[PDB]
Amino acid sequence: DHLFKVLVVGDAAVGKTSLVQRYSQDSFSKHYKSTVGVDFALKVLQWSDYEIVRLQLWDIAGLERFAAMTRLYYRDASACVIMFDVTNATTFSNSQRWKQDLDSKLTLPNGEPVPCLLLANKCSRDQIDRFSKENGFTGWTETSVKENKNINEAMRVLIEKMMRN
Amino acid sequence: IGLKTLDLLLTSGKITLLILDEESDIFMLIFDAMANDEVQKLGCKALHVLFERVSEEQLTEFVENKDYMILLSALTNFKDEEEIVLHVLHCLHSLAIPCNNVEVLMSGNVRCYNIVVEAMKAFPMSERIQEVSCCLLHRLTLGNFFNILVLNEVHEFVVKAVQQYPENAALQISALSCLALLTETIFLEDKLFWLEACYKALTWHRKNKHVQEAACWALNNLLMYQNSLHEKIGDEDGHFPAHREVMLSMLMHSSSKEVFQASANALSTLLEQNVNFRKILLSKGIHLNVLELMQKHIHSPEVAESGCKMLNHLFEGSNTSLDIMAAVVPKILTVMKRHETSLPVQLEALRAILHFIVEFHHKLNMVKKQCFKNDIHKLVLAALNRFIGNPGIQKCGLKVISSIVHFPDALEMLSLEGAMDSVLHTLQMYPDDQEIQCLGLSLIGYLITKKNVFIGTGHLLAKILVSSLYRFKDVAEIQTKGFQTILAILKLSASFSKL
Amino acid sequence: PYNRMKLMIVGNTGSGKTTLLQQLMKMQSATVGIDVKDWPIQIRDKRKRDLVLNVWDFAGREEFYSTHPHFMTQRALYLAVYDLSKGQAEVDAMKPWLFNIKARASSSPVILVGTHLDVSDEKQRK
Ligand SMILES: Nc1nc2c(ncn2[C@@H]2O[C@H](COP(=O)(O)OP(=O)(O)O)[C@@H](O)[C@H]2O)c(=O)[nH]1
């Protein structure tokens, strides 16, 4: 039995709740709306026999991007994911801003930054390759929120990467 | 000019201690200074700055003299003067710190009328004056708060103050704490604005522990005394989404036990109010989460009690899986074991265990064996044996044992621990209660062994059985259980019939 | 260090013990039993540590004399207020007090403060 907390960050109106409802409540696409406040979801994964892991997904509201991101959101947080809409370079710049803020406001018992996943929602991989190699993130994966084509494999890879540490 | 120079000098700091260590009685100087109106305001009312350090008895003498002088001068000159009224009120705040002086300040309810008038007229749209007066309101709360009309007036004033200045932490803490205490007082329209203020307090002050604790305490106490608006909270439009805010506050400030207690009590009252919120918090993953929080906070009994109350009100009326059982029951067992003397913690843990305990068969057998290996029987027997009062824990313990007995391995450990003597003693001390008698009479036949009636000795058994059956002769269930128990006993030894 | 001491004021009735205590420290029909008070004396100089004299104003009427020696102890200072308007019999009247003071506290300061001198003559004083 183990507990982990994953913080989902990104821009606004980019389906931040879409990925977490597809991953936990098994709902894809649907109407896209704005997130009033921080919301929570529970995921249960049977990664190994007699070893059950629980995941708490926190999908932080991106409306307060200019606001000072409180360290209490990231306090005791174990893992993170960055999700950006692939139809705007402004979303890419926002994801850069979130990654920089996280690198400025995160700590670990070992001191190394928590694993990060660059998720391209609502699917130009060559353009993203430069930042994939430059930012030093754990991995990069594209997916579509409406189709849920690659969310499961990406999250499984992220959980395995976390359990490697 | 002397007062002005003294006031600007005392802003430097590290000199007020030197001034108080003088010999010319600067206190008496300021008292003798005051009908100038410009004076006293000129004095800068640094009496409050001095009242920061004045020693309580010296402060009480200061209280008689200052109440007289300040009340008269302040009322006139300051009814016309924001600074004078503010300074007099904050000096009264510094003066009212000792617990003995509150009755002095309420000798003729002059302080209450003064603060009410100041809130009404002195500061219609002023922040610092309202903050000081509201701090007075919070400080002036005790067992002597049965001032009905004054209570209504001050409640209206503080509520108006919250809706007119919700962006500062000076008001929200004191206002919401006094608001909770006074709503507990008076409740023996308003609710919409009250929860609006509470929701704004939770949302706009997420980083301040005290504001969140006070606001969720106010929400809890209001919902406790007002159950009609349980449907007025929710994610649907027209309802304040306070449940997520309470959870978020609890999680950000898990290091603080006070916010945990207040938030857990608040959402426990909310869950008891309406059952629709249950199975939604479970979907949010809070049960094992609050279990982890109690694991972090184990040195205190209040945090464990509040968490057990949350579990009791969260898992009521629902059925979980074996994984949830294996993840929940050991934590509650550890919490009960570490806290063996606290009556509320034991009662809440027993209630939670009772409400939660009752391919697939093998897994459940494994869960039962793990629970048995966690020394559940010893803990529950110790809890219900050491604490012979508070019959509720007795009912919970008998129910838990009744659920325990039909486990695969229950009989041997139950007999070794000596549960039978505990059951017999419980029946002896509670002759008149019905549920205890029914549960005990059903249980006795279940845990009876040949050792308990060895060599024909079983007189307390017969005495208790006959007494229980005779006292409740018309209750069909009690008689049925008693006669089944008697037949079970006779199946072992026939000599018992003689007894 | 502990700056605390008991001060005892004794004498016959009408001597002026209560009035003397009021004058020094700052409806006196009688002082029934013993009046216990605390005298906070912080000398104006900060060098002198603040004393708290435990004042025990004793009765003057003879009905209370039986229980007085139980509360007379060492580690205390004694006053001996004697009226001057009465004449010279006050000296005789204070002998029982001095006897009990000596019996209970052999080594303790004794101060004899003749009061009500505003009416007394110098021959009586001598
Ligand atoms: N002769 C005289 N007596 C005074 C004067 N002022 C006060 N007294 C009396 O002195 C008494 C105090 O003596 P005290 O030792 O307290 O007597 P006790 O109360 O009987 O033990 C008071 O009861 C006063 O009535 C004064 O100016 N002249």
UniProtKB/Swiss-Prot annotation, chain A:
Its main location: membrane. Ubiquitous. It is found in: Cell membrane; Cytoplasm; Cytoplasm, Perinuclear region; Golgi apparatus. Disulfide bonds: none annotated. Keywords: Cell membrane, Cytoplasm, Cytoskeleton, Differentiation, Golgi apparatus, GTP-binding, Lipoprotein, Membrane, Nucleotide-binding, Phosphoprotein, Prenylation, Protein transport, Transport, Vacuole. GTP binds at S29, K30, H31, Y32, K33, T35, K122, V145, K146. A motif (Effector region) lies at residues 32-40. In case of Salmonella enterica serovar Typhimurium (S.typhimurium) infection, is proteolytically cleaved between Gly-37 and Val-38 by the GtgE viral protease encoded on the Gifsy-2 lysogen bacteriophage, which therefore prevents the recruitment of RAB29 to S.typhimurium-containing vacuoles. In contrast, no proteolytically cleavage is detected in S.typhi-infected cells. It is a lipid-anchor. The record marks G37, V38 as: Cleavage. GO terms for cellular component: cis-Golgi network; cytoplasm; cytoskeleton; cytosol; early endosome; endomembrane system; extracellular exosome; Golgi apparatus. The modification Phosphothreonine is found at A67. One of its GO terms (biological process) is T cell activation. Belongs to the small GTPase superfamily. Rab family. The small GTPases Rab are key regulators in vesicle trafficking. Essential for maintaining the integrity of the endosome-trans-Golgi network structure. Together with LRRK2, plays a role in the retrograde trafficking pathway for recycling proteins, such as mannose 6 phosphate receptor (M6PR), between lysosomes and the Golgi apparatus in a retromer-dependent manner. Recruits LRRK2 to the Golgi complex and stimulates LRRK2 kinase activity. Stimulates phosphorylation of RAB10 'Thr-73' by LRRK2. Regulates neuronal process morphology in the intact central nervous system (CNS). Interacts with LRRK2 (via the N-terminus); this interaction is direct and stimulates kinase activity. This is Ras-related protein Rab-7L1. It comes from Homo sapiens. The chain holds residues 5 to 176 of 203 of the full protein.
From Swiss-Prot, chain B:
It comes from Homo sapiens (Human). The seven-bladed WD repeat region is critical for synaptic vesicle trafficking and mediates interaction with multiple vesicle-associated presynaptic proteins. It also mediates homodimerization and regulates kinase activity. The COR domain mediates homodimerization; it also mediates homotetramerization via interaction with the protein kinase domain. Ubiquitinated by TRIM1; undergoes 'Lys-48'-linked polyubiquitination leading to proteasomal degradation. Transmembrane segments: none annotated. It is found in: Cytoplasmic vesicle; Perikaryon; Golgi apparatus membrane; Cell projection, Axon. Serine/threonine-protein kinase which phosphorylates a broad range of proteins involved in multiple processes such as neuronal plasticity, innate immunity, autophagy, and vesicle trafficking. Is a key regulator of RAB GTPases by regulating the GTP/GDP exchange and interaction partners of RABs through phosphorylation. Phosphorylates RAB3A, RAB3B, RAB3C, RAB3D, RAB5A, RAB5B, RAB5C, RAB8A, RAB8B, RAB10, RAB12, RAB29, RAB35, and RAB43. Regulates the RAB3IP-catalyzed GDP/GTP exchange for RAB8A through the phosphorylation of 'Thr-72' on RAB8A. It comes from the Eukaryota. This is Leucine-rich repeat serine/threonine-protein kinase 2. Homodimer. Homotetramer; when activated by GTP-bound RAB29. Interacts with PRKN, PRDX3, and TPCN2. Interacts with VPS35. Interacts (via N-terminus) with RAB29; this interaction is direct and stimulates kinase activity. Interacts (via ROC domain) with SEC16A. Interacts with APP; interaction promotes phosphorylation of 'Thr-743' of APP. Interacts with MAPT. Interacts with RAB8A, RAB10, and RAB12. Interacts (via N-terminus) with RAB32. The gene is LRRK2.
From Swiss-Prot, chain C:
Signal peptide: none annotated. It is found in: Cytoplasmic vesicle; Perikaryon; Golgi apparatus membrane; Cell projection, Axon. Changing I34V: In PARK8; uncertain significance. Changing R104C: In PARK8; shows an increase in activity in both autophosphorylation and phosphorylation of a generic substrate; loss of interaction with SEC16A; shows an increase in activity in phosphorylation of RAB10; decreases phosphorylation-dependent binding to YWHAG; significantly suppresses lysosomal enlargement when overexpressed in LRRK2 knockout cells due to increased phosphorylation of Rab proteins. The modification Phosphoserine is found at S107. It comes from the Eukaryota. Changing R104G: Decreased membrane association. Inhibits autophosphorylation and RAB10 phosphorylation. Expressed in pyramidal neurons in all cortical laminae of the visual cortex, in neurons of the substantia nigra pars compacta and caudate putamen (at protein level). Expressed in neutrophils (at protein level). Expressed in the brain. Expressed throughout the adult brain, but at a lower level than in heart and liver. Also expressed in placenta, lung, skeletal muscle, kidney and pancreas. In the brain, expressed in the cerebellum, cerebral cortex, medulla, spinal cord occipital pole, frontal lobe, temporal lobe and putamen. Expression is particularly high in brain dopaminoceptive areas. Changing K17A: GTPase-dead mutant. Loss of interaction with SEC16A and impaired ability to recruit SEC16A to endoplasmic reticulum exit sites. Residues 1-126 form the Roc domain. Belongs to the protein kinase superfamily. TKL Ser/Thr protein kinase family. This is Leucine-rich repeat serine/threonine-protein kinase 2. It comes from Homo sapiens. The lineage of its organism: Eukaryota, Metazoa, Chordata, Craniata, Vertebrata. The gene is LRRK2. The chain holds residues 1331 to 1463 of 2527 of the full protein.
